[PDB]
Enzyme design. Sequence first.
Site, PDB file in Angstrom:
ATOM      1  N   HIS A   1      40.078  40.584  78.325  1.00  0.00           N
ATOM      2  CA  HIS A   1      41.380  40.085  77.763  1.00  0.00           C
ATOM      3  C   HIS A   1      41.655  41.187  76.633  1.00  0.00           C
ATOM      4  O   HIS A   1      42.681  40.589  75.827  1.00  0.00           O
ATOM      5  CB  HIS A   1      41.315  38.609  77.661  1.00  0.00           C
ATOM      6  CG  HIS A   1      40.485  38.110  76.692  1.00  0.00           C
ATOM      7  ND1 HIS A   1      40.825  38.161  75.414  1.00  0.00           N
ATOM      8  CD2 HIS A   1      39.388  37.374  76.820  1.00  0.00           C
ATOM      9  CE1 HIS A   1      39.637  37.141  74.800  1.00  0.00           C
ATOM     10  NE2 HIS A   1      38.911  37.046  75.826  1.00  0.00           N
TER      11      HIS A   1
ATOM     12  N   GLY B   1      39.121  36.077  66.855  1.00  0.00           N
ATOM     13  CA  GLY B   1      38.337  37.592  66.902  1.00  0.00           C
ATOM     14  C   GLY B   1      36.764  37.343  67.125  1.00  0.00           C
ATOM     15  O   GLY B   1      36.196  38.636  66.996  1.00  0.00           O
TER      16      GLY B   1
ATOM     17  N   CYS C   1      35.521  36.716  70.090  1.00  0.00           N
ATOM     18  CA  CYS C   1      35.363  37.250  71.303  1.00  0.00           C
ATOM     19  C   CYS C   1      34.550  38.520  71.550  1.00  0.00           C
ATOM     20  O   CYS C   1      34.565  39.340  70.584  1.00  0.00           O
ATOM     21  CB  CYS C   1      36.675  37.377  72.039  1.00  0.00           C
ATOM     22  SG  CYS C   1      37.528  35.789  72.462  1.00  0.00           S
TER      23      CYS C   1
END
Lengths: 306, 306
Positions: A41, A143, A145
């Site tokens: 993503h 942030g 991820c």
Amino acid sequence: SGFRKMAFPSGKVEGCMVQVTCGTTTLNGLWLDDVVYCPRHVICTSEDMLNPNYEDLLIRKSNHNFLVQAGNVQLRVIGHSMQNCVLKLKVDTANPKTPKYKFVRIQPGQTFSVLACYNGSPSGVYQCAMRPNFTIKGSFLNGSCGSVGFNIDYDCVSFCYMHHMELPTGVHAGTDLEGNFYGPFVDRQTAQAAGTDTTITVNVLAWLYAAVINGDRWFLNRFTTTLNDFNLVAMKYNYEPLTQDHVDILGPLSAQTGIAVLDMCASLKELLQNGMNGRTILGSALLEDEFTPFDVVRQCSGVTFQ
Amino acid sequence: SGFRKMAFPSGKVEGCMVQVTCGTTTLNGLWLDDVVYCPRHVICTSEDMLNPNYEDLLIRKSNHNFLVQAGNVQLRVIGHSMQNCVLKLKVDTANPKTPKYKFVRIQPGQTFSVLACYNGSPSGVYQCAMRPNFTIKGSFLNGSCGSVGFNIDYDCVSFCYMHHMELPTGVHAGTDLEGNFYGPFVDRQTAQAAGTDTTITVNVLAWLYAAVINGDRWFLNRFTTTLNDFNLVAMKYNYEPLTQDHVDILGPLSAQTGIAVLDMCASLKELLQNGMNGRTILGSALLEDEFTPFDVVRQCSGVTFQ
Ligand SMILES: *[C@@](O)(c1nc2c(F)cccc2s1)[C@H](C[C@@H]1CCNC1=O)NC(=O)[C@@H]1[C@@H]2[C@H](CN1C(=O)[C@@H](NC(=O)C(F)(F)F)C(C)(C)C)C2(C)C
Ligand SMILES: *[C@@](O)(c1nc2c(F)cccc2s1)[C@H](C[C@@H]1CCNC1=O)NC(=O)[C@@H]1[C@@H]2[C@H](CN1C(=O)[C@@H](NC(=O)C(F)(F)F)C(C)(C)C)C2(C)C
């Protein structure tokens, strides 16, 4: 003596963290040899996230659209492919700090350390359990991820988790390093909730052994029980069934302390039925279920790495 | 969201750990530039520990008697001196992995990460507080001596603790990096016990702010109080006095949440008088006092290092 929630030393994993940017989305990536692994993503905009078509977004991108940075240095991307919910970016430079590593998928009840990162840099490290309902009880912000979870065996880092999302009740969900989710979650902003959680019975028993090792022994009673009777009681307090494999895995601790697993089970049964009556065990007012038998042994016997 | 006991990333400190052996005593040392720092009791035998004369034991040793190993490599010692309860071994090789660093002495109530080590190798990392009574609630075994505690600010490692001993009730005592003990302890096997501990009030308040940030808000009442009234109540539950400096230090969190410190104080007062009534706060059944205001901000705002 003393017993703490201890994380693995994070150095070997710190040396692998990078920042991946695609447009205005930046997140963390894991650089092993000449490949960068990150959540797919990274290729999404704000408007893409209700229901993204990742395969469609990806075909529209080329190598140069992916900005990978290791500290001050930009890594030139020379290939890209998608594996499940993960993106693999081949780069022209092998990471010289790559440790010996493997990718594993853990089972519910297993623990691991998380190296929480923002912009490819580490914020901190903490120990977590994969819950029976396939969430983790993490601490993650926007942030985070691409942050990873791992175990160490001597010199080998086993990567087991990559972070993707936060679910209702502020718990967390993510993938193994082949990009397959733990549990039935998907990587889209849509309504999803974890099923009811349960207590990881074998871990509670391991922590009770740790308490005895540390001299905290008030909850030991003079009884035993059968596995069947124990499991009927556990079921009512939303505890996982204890299997024969769990009994076998508890064998080292049992052997060390001199307390048969089924006797510890009698003591836990009393705790579940009567409560702790305002007492603590190892400083805790609740029964803890995020230490595995192996976590207890490694802490109490001083197992080291590197 | 989520809130965990988070340790600093340990990599920069992992690169500094070595093993120091003198006779049959082996413990951990910290190699910064061309100096190795370790507890002076590395020079003691079994028979020396009731009441050792370190200065006498040391004059009997020469450089070559100190075996320093970094992994496979032996470091040649070329000088030695004692500073308080620490030994400094000058070696012929500067550690190339030395980070920017400082030596600091912390105050009671301050937190830090411990990198627990055996034989110069890391076992794990965990966060700790310097208690009001100058102990830490650690997890340390035989061979852990010379393990260090530290904070990180951007790229700078501040070393604040070196581990020496375990006291009654399984708590721990040690020195700053100039070898001065925290608290009135001495490095000899003799009867010593920590004074009564107290709760670090400012930290409990910081953790209550963390709870509100994470949406756990049931304990907030509609009252305020004066600092004086609050401190009379705290004193009876063995809580530290809250000073004006503590109030000022809580200002960021107060400003972020919209809750005046003295209102949070009214809410804590109710908790102390009435108990939690079987509820948890951030998953905990007891009030936690091992997060500082700064620890709360760094976790909840995603502050990174390296
Ligand atoms: C992650 O760090 C990042 N995700 C993006 C992104 F999609 C675009 C640009 C930059 C980043 S960083 C982030 C970690 C989360 C944020 C808060 N705590 C975390 O753990 N992940 C997400 O934001 C994630 C991605 C879209 C929506 N996401 C969610 O975590 C949402 N959850 C869900 O929709 C639910 F799980 F289904 F409940 C959110 C934002 C918490 C409501 C996607 C899943 C692709
Ligand atoms: C430390 O790791 C080491 N100390 C020695 C040593 F002296 C000779 C050879 C090898 C080592 S390793 C060790 C860490 C302790 C052990 C258990 N948990 C720990 O944190 N420190 C000590 O053993 C220490 C050294 C002698 C006696 N020590 C104690 O910790 C004792 N405590 C006290 O006597 C008391 F604090 F005063 F209470 C002990 C062993 C726990 C009873 C000295 C202080 C020099």
